[PDB]
Amino acid sequence: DDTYAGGQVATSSNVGFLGSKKFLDTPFNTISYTDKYIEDKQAKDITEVIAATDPSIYTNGASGGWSENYYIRGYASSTNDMSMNGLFGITPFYRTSPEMFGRVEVLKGPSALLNGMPPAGSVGGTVNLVTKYAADEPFARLTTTYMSDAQFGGHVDVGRRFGENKEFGVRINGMYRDGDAAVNDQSKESRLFSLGLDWQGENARVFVDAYDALDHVDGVTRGVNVSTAVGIPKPPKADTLLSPDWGSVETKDKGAMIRGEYDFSDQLMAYAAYGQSTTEYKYNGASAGTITSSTGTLSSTLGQLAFDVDKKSADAGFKGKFETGSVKHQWVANATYYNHTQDDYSYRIIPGFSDPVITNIYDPNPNWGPKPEFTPPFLFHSTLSTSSFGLADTLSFAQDKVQLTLGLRHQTVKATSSVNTLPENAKSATTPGVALLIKATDKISVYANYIEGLTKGDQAPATASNPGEIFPPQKTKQQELGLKVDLGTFAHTLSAFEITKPSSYLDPSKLVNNLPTFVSDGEQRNRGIEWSFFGSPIEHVRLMGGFTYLDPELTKTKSGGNDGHTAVAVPKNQAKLGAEWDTQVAQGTLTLSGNINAVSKQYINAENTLSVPGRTLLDVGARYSTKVEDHPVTFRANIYNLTNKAYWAQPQLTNLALGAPRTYMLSVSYDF
């Protein structure tokens, strides 16, 4: 079995191009969630999977935003930067419904050695989505879903293997759901069709995945801005929508990939992966609300955006083992390629609709005005290309009890834009990694790593002493020290880390030829301690979660103005706890569940003069699983934000947004 006691977490995960590694063999803080856990949470997106019990992950928790939004180790981790089966550029751009995945894997911290630079250059962590393939036994499950107030849905999952040796597999997933959600005047529509094909040969293997997805929100949440002069007013009740009720966002995503492996011997393997995807995004609504008085007056400017992006992606390489003296080597060498082309259509100012719409956030009957026709004109075409070449070796001493991993990767990046007159060139950087793992016993591992993340370099403006200079890719740097303990059915991780991340800015205090200079002297430093755990500490009980302390400090900022201040948006303290308790009832198993998610305050600006308080959220759940004439049936009921706590937290692009209100979810599932 791959799965740990309880069924919710897997025992191994993909560690970029080092491939599959077990929990106690992995000198990084990783976790992998099963499809069972996904169905048990009734998760509708990736955030609801990876944020529920992990204290190193934070979301502002808004309902029906234009994308998912989460941080890992106190840094942004962009939805653009998820991998599928280890390959970037395939998954949906902004929001991914998790019906098509057998695992959701999280690797905490930056990982450029392992993965290369993902398209948006975030460095918080890597989320890897592993698709489903057909199990040996024919399989068909139908599930009907409900989410308050009036969203109804279904999901069908069928699988079957063919050939004399079941060497071919086919796995199909289909999902649709539609209707009013828990926020007033907001509705959500989701559609997925997916396909997982595989062929197992004697010396060779091929895996194909393709999918078609739709995500649509009417009454999309955009959030709102505040100033120090006016203040942050008390949050309205939690089901309030503070963006136009006619506003909407729609993302269509299509993707396909193929992987191939060829075993030359038991010591040498080649592999290749190729994929492509398409994203069509449209948005019509507020570009931002602004709170203009302490009585709750709100001023919302309107904007429109569409973009189309075509992506291509590849990763090919060789893996091998050999021995020298009493040292075992496991090596890999790979090359990656990513390219996208993009068209952007946009109104900054919409004709007829440049006067902002004036409301009050506490109003039960806001007048949002008419809905402008959607006609954004073409603005610019843009491209992004990346490529990389990586080498690594894992050396093992003393019967596999000491493992030293060394490697490096060369990374190249180039961006173009059809409205940029400044020069456009590729830039490169070399990023090393080293990680040490010691097995004290066969139940206890201690580990340390140094590893980097990469972000494309900014370009100096025409106003600067160094006008049009393009910086090389910028290096985020992690040191980590950790301890892992597997007691058998229950496991612990304790880790400490320090991660520095640079930023770049125009600096009026460093004059060259009497002009401001563009520099990469900016720095944020996140130090943290994480204690987390999972599994079944007693019979019939499951328990997952942990506690983190995080110190996310702006150590160097423009002019020194904000030196020593705390980073925006993320909390310093998190405690999360998910529990499940099983009990035999009639002809089936009843499970009760509860979650608590407690966080401390967050700063809203880098001056640290505005903040929002901490908050504690509770969720409860019941689940009944039985057979009806010998067919497995599972009934599920959940309530999220049970106390209907109203809270502000920080999303992308704007200062504040309301967290999701109390939400009920029901589902029933039936195996044929």
Author numbering: 32 to 703
What does the report in the manuscript say about this coordinate set?
The A. baumannii outer-membrane transporter protein, BauA, that recognises this siderophore has itself been identified as a vaccine candidate. The siderophore is known to be bound from the medium by the integral outer-membrane BauA protein. BauA has the typical outer-membrane TonB-dependent transporter (TBDT) fold with a β-barrel formed by 22 antiparallel strands, several extracellular loops, and a plug domain folded inside of the barrel. Acinetobactin is synthesized as a precursor, preacinetobactin, which rearranges non-enzymatically and irreversibly at pH >7 to give acinetobactin.
Residues 33 to 703 of the protein are well defined in the electron density map, while the N-terminal region comprising the TonB box is missing, presumably because it is flexible. Compared to the other TBDTs, the extracellular loops of the β-barrel form a large open cavity bordered by mainly short and apolar amino acids giving large access to the loops NL1-NL3 of the plug domain. The asymmetric unit contains three monomers arranged around a threefold symmetry axis reminiscent of the porin arrangement and thus plausibly biologically meaningful. PISA, a computational assessment of oligomeric state in the crystal, suggests a trimer with a high degree of confidence. Biophysical methods (gel filtration and light scattering) do not support a trimeric assembly. Size Exclusion Chromatography coupled to Multi-Angle Light Scattering (SEC-MALS) analysis in C8E4 is consistent with monomer whilst native gel shows the protein runs more closely to a dimer; however, the detergent bound to the protein may increase the apparent weight suggesting a monomer in solution.
